[PDB]
Each structure stands twice: as C-alpha cells, then as structure tokens.
Amino acid sequence: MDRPFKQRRSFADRCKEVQQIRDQHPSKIPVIIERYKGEKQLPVLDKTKFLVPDHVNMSELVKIIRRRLQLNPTQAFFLLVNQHSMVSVSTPIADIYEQEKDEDGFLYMVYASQET
Ligand SMILES: CO[C@@H]1[C@@H](OC(N)=O)[C@@H](O)[C@H](Oc2ccc3c(O)c(NC(=O)c4ccc(O)c(CC=C(C)C)c4)c(=O)oc3c2C)OC1(C)C
C-alpha cells in the first residue's frame, strides 16, 4: 500500500523474509527504498522492495534509481542510507550491508530532493 514498509510488516515477518531471501537469492542484498515523508518534488517510485546484486556500488545505485524515477536533467536527487548521501560511495553494497543494515536484515534507503 502507501504506508511505509515497517508499518505494514511486523519485525518478525520482515526477519523471516530476509532469511527466505538468504536461502533463495544468496548473492543479493534485500533493500527497502522509500520516498522521504515530507518530499514534495520527487515522485513515488513504482515499488519499494528490491534485491540488489551485492557487487553493485552504492554510487551506481544512485544513478540507477535516478533513471528509474524519470526525472528531468536538473532535478535534485539524493539517496540516503542512515542519513548519509550515497552519491560518492563507490563501494559494493555487500561491504556496507553489514554495517548499515536494519536489525530486521533489510537495508533501508530514503530518497529526497534535499539532504539534511
Ligand atoms: C520473499 O522473496 C520475494 C520473492 O519470492 C520468492 N519465492 O522468490 C518474490 O516474491 C519477489 O522476488 C524478487 C523481487 C525483486 C527482485 C529484484 O528487485 C531484483 N534485482 C535485479 O534484478 C537488479 C539487477 C541489477 C541492479 O543494479 C539492481 C538495482 C536496481 C535499483 C534498486 C532500482 C537490481 C532481483 O534479481 O530479483 C528480485 C526477485 C527475485 O520478491 C521477494 C524477493 C521479496
């Protein structure tokens, strides 16, 4: 629906789903990508739950998500993980998953037209 993921799924069920994904997609990182609650410029992505092959750099994900949003060339766009902008993080998602993942095992990201 429209409510954020953590509002729709219990912590238990989210954990259980991450365990399922470890069995069924071992090389992928499970991620939740959501629009900032107070965002007024950027549109809402078609979907919010993704798997990411774990070699993809965070910096590349910024470019991929920006393409998916179909913005104009000048629109501001920031992808935030635990409030940090990912635009210059040329590090595989595998290597930041363990430091930045939620207790439920998903890696959460927020996009917005401003950083702070
Ligand atoms: C509980 O798992 C479910 C799946 O259930 C089962 N039995 O497999 C199924 O219901 C659905 O399956 C999905 C759902 C989403 C993706 C998915 O989003 C994938 N990602 C890519 O193909 C991909 C490849 C390259 C790349 O740079 C990016 C990043 C894309 C950005 C975030 C827009 C993504 C993928 O490989 O597999 C996916 C699969 C198998 O969603 C899950 C994982 C929650």
Side-chain angles (χ1 to χ4, degrees), residues 17 20-21 24-25 28 31 33 45 47 49-53 56 61 64-65 68:
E17 189 173 349
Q20 183 178 349
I21 295 168
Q24 301 177 346
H25 316 270
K28 315 273 179 67
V31 308
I33 300 172
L45 259 185
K47 60 143 147 160
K49 191 188 304 179
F50 301 79
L51 304 186
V52 184
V56 177
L61 277 182
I64 290 163
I65 297 164
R68 206 172 172 90

Side-chain angles (χ1 to χ4, degrees), residues 6-15 17-106:
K6 283 190 172 179
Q7 289 183 24
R8 304 186 272 109
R9 303 280 162 218
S10 71
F11 175 81
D13 292 341
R14 293 181 255 124
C15 282
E17 189 173 349
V18 171
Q19 296 169 34
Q20 183 178 349
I21 295 168
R22 277 203 291 273
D23 290 342
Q24 301 177 346
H25 316 270
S27 76
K28 315 273 179 67
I29 297 311
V31 308
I32 300 292
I33 300 172
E34 296 173 321
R35 191 179 73 169
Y36 183 42
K37 185 198 169 182
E39 179 61 42
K40 327 290 191 197
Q41 295 179 25
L42 297 173
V44 176
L45 259 185
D46 62 306
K47 60 143 147 160
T48 62
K49 191 188 304 179
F50 301 79
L51 304 186
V52 184
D54 70 356
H55 69 273
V56 177
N57 294 323
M58 299 312 288
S59 59
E60 179 40 10
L61 277 182
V62 177
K63 301 195 183 190
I64 290 163
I65 297 164
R66 209 203 145 93
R67 278 199 294 275
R68 206 172 172 90
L69 280 168
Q70 296 213 83
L71 315 172
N72 65 31
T74 167
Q75 169 62 33
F77 167 77
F78 299 95
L79 181 74
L80 306 186
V81 172
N82 292 317
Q83 309 193 291
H84 291 284
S85 172
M86 294 294 103
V87 59
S88 285
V89 173
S90 50
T91 298
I93 187 172
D95 299 350
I96 62 129
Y97 173 70
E98 313 263 55
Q99 177 63 49
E100 300 302 334
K101 69 191 187 214
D102 190 87
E103 288 278 273
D104 70 10
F106 281 97

